[PDB]
Amino acid sequence: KLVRLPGLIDVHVHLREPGGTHKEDFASGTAAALAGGITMVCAMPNTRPPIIDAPALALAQKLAEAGARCDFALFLGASSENAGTLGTVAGSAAGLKLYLNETFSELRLDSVVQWMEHFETWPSHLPIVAHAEQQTVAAVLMVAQLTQRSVHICHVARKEEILLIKAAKARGLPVTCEVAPHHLFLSHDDLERLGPGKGEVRPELGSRQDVEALWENMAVIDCFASDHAPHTLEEKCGSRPPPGFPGLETMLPLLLTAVSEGWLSLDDLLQRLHHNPRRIFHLPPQEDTYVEVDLEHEWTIPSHMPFSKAHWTPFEGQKVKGTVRRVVLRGEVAYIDGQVLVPPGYGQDVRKWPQGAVPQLP
Amino acid sequence: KLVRLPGLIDVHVHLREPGGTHKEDFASGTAAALAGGITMVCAMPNTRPPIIDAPALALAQKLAEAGARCDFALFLGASSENAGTLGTVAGSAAGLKLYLNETFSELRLDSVVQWMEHFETWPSHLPIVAHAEQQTVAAVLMVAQLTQRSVHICHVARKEEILLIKAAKARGLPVTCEVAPHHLFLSHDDLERLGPGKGEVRPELGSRQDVEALWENMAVIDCFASDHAPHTLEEKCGSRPPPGFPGLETMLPLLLTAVSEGWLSLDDLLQRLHHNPRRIFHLPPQEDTYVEVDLEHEWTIPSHMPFSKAHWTPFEGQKVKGTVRRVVLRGEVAYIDGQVLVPPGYGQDVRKWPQGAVPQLP
Ligand SMILES: O=C(O)c1[nH]c(=O)[nH]c(=O)c1F
Ligand SMILES: O=C(O)c1[nH]c(=O)[nH]c(=O)c1F
Ligand SMILES: [Zn+2]
Ligand SMILES: [Zn+2]
Ligand SMILES: [Zn+2]
Ligand SMILES: [Zn+2]
């Protein structure tokens, strides 16, 4: 007996096109998405060139429209130079992403005053999300209150962070957050197995106490999002390993295993992979779209999942219960039992749908 | 310049058919809904006969399918005799409604043990909502924790109640709630104008401090819902006035006025009249459905709105800014500038849509 789920949404993926297509491209990454039961993705802007101006966004839109197999929205990225320049294209993006900790030079902000400038100039009705670790969570929350608007915290990974967000919500502050599967299912205990290269990720893997705190505070977690961050094994095992894990193909099997174990309910999962992503990012419904899963099938994650060009996974060897059997996207069979059946280019930019525009006052 | 909104959802209406059709019927009440920018309603079960068994639900479904002009789901009602008997029809209903304070004999529960029995036997994946005032909020929350499931509190009307819910959410308990417009825009101060008959409503009108507490704690309010409770003027002004206000045609104009005044944002409104209703009750999207509003037009609420058979309103004389200009429902023009253009029977039972079934484990 298969269970029908709505089309799931991952609001945090890195699809590496343009400029890193040996790691992933729209076609391979959205294949990975569909195989993971994900029918809509929001793609981060730290590509090469990064999506920090209108020409780069225009290029990325065409690459995505030609390569994506599932539907998508594209983030714009904040830079030290583009505050106040994005007004005409802001509504066409998923939102604005701030890299407030480590990143490459083009996305680095050197002063909290630059964060303030972005919060002040980005249209107030559109989403802002932040990579903000440890005290940076408190700092960006302060900037949000000074400018009287909301903020969404990406990949919350620590007891410290979820408890700060919990306190902020108790005071009625408009903050939401997401958690990635590696911060719920991996910890320091796994670093010996993974090694120092494979294990590199930002936010880093937490302690067992961090993991337990995120589970205990599930009510504070608005979304799950993979932070699909593909790099090849050569790169992860080399002399300057880049941080990040691929995760699209493993995130739903891991969470379905947790559901089967009673760690959270099926509704808890669907709030965090469907309803709350929709409502935080104003993402439109997908007509005739659904995912059929088998909650009985037991399997062991292999050394690499079939589709991501990363060709490795930190979850190798984990026993899971739950698998994606079939995905229907806008009335076409998109995935069955390991076979992707929609071509590159089938996916669409949801921000161009009339129902995908963010409502605003005139 | 008109603003396009998604199709709004009111999860708490009384449409009085069967058995009170001089007060309202599916056709007139859903006309009122469309004129208020509402494209989907959840209808309460305290009709005559009340919707407390499978035959009554079957009758109500046909009456709604023949009379409704917008889409709908129908609540089942808890009784002293039907716990453990609703399993085969539960998934076809909006949810289960508990009347825990005043109601008529057929829906009265005489013991908290009967509440426990309903929480124990109603399928755990389906919604339960409660009329639960003052300490009854705490009592039903206790029953929800004893049975390890969620509950939704209807029309929260008091500082006492919203602060108790706030405390429950801070402890991570699965509770949501709704607030009706009369508890945000009317108070004790209005009882002299309204008189003792018109002013009868349950929950009663609150103090200015109650109203201010609900606004201050907007972050705790998950949904707005009208509690559209129509009775004729003759009945409201008679010797045994029934409690309740009509509200479908006034609720969005009132809240749009608040948005124009800066009391809450347009997003705050759409979370509470669209996204959160969807996700709490697992209600499906409506394809090709949207509402165009004019946020500039100033007008004064008259002595009766055009469509509700109640033919009166407690908001008479309130100055509002904001009006519904056009409603499109599933690709047909449903309402323009005071004219309803879809016939009785156009509306459908969303629980019969494949996307409208509540996901559950096998
Ligand atoms: O793009 C990446 O690889 C990446 N990887 C990470 O582990 N963290 C990031 O914040 C990031 F942008
Ligand atoms: O149906 C009604 O009129 C009604 N009216 C109210 O004012 N409160 C109720 O709880 C109710 F069921
Ligand atoms: Zn990041
Ligand atoms: Zn990332
Ligand atoms: Zn009630
Ligand atoms: Zn009611």
Short mmCIF file of N, CA, C and O and ligand atoms in Angstrom, two decimals, chain B residues 12 14 44 46 97-99 102 130-133 154-155 178 202-203 227, ligand 5:
data_model
loop_
_atom_site.label_atom_id
_atom_site.label_comp_id
_atom_site.label_asym_id
_atom_site.label_seq_id
_atom_site.Cartn_x
_atom_site.Cartn_y
_atom_site.Cartn_z
N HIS B 12 -14.61 28.31 9.68
CA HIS B 12 -15.64 28.32 10.73
C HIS B 12 -16.86 29.12 10.28
O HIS B 12 -16.96 30.32 10.56
N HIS B 14 -21.39 28.80 9.86
CA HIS B 14 -22.66 28.13 10.10
C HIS B 14 -23.58 28.46 8.93
O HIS B 14 -23.99 29.62 8.78
N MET B 44 -20.00 24.20 10.05
CA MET B 44 -20.13 23.55 11.34
C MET B 44 -21.35 22.63 11.38
O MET B 44 -22.27 22.77 10.57
N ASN B 46 -23.82 21.98 13.72
CA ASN B 46 -24.94 22.16 14.64
C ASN B 46 -26.22 22.57 13.92
O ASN B 46 -26.95 23.46 14.37
N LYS B 97 -15.80 18.51 15.32
CA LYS B 97 -16.06 19.66 16.18
C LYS B 97 -16.63 19.21 17.53
O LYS B 97 -17.60 18.45 17.57
N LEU B 98 -16.01 19.67 18.60
CA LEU B 98 -16.51 19.49 19.97
C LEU B 98 -17.10 20.79 20.51
O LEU B 98 -16.43 21.81 20.53
N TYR B 99 -18.37 20.74 20.93
CA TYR B 99 -19.01 21.85 21.63
C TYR B 99 -18.86 21.61 23.12
O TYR B 99 -19.61 20.83 23.71
N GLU B 102 -21.74 25.95 25.93
CA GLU B 102 -23.18 25.92 25.65
C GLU B 102 -23.43 25.38 24.24
O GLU B 102 -22.68 25.68 23.30
N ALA B 130 -12.39 22.70 18.73
CA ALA B 130 -13.23 22.80 19.92
C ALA B 130 -13.70 24.23 20.17
O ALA B 130 -12.92 25.19 20.10
N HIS B 131 -14.99 24.34 20.47
CA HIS B 131 -15.52 25.51 21.17
C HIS B 131 -15.18 25.33 22.64
O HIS B 131 -15.74 24.46 23.31
N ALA B 132 -14.26 26.14 23.14
CA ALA B 132 -13.67 25.92 24.46
C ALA B 132 -13.28 27.29 25.01
O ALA B 132 -12.28 27.88 24.57
N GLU B 133 -14.06 27.79 25.96
CA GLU B 133 -13.90 29.13 26.50
C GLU B 133 -13.24 29.09 27.87
O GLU B 133 -13.52 28.21 28.68
N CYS B 154 -11.29 27.04 18.54
CA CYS B 154 -12.12 27.97 17.78
C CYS B 154 -12.22 29.31 18.49
O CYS B 154 -11.99 29.43 19.70
N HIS B 155 -12.63 30.33 17.72
CA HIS B 155 -12.84 31.70 18.18
C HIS B 155 -12.29 32.01 19.56
O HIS B 155 -13.02 32.05 20.55
N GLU B 178 -7.81 30.09 16.18
CA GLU B 178 -8.39 31.06 15.28
C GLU B 178 -9.02 32.18 16.11
O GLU B 178 -9.38 31.98 17.27
N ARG B 202 -21.50 33.91 21.51
CA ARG B 202 -20.64 33.04 22.31
C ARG B 202 -19.44 32.66 21.46
O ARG B 202 -19.62 32.06 20.38
N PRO B 203 -18.20 32.97 21.88
CA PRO B 203 -17.82 33.73 23.09
C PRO B 203 -18.38 35.14 23.09
O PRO B 203 -18.49 35.76 22.03
N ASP B 227 -16.69 32.71 12.22
CA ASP B 227 -17.82 32.17 12.98
C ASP B 227 -19.12 32.82 12.52
O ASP B 227 -19.95 33.27 13.32
ZN ZN C 5 -18.59 28.24 18.81
#
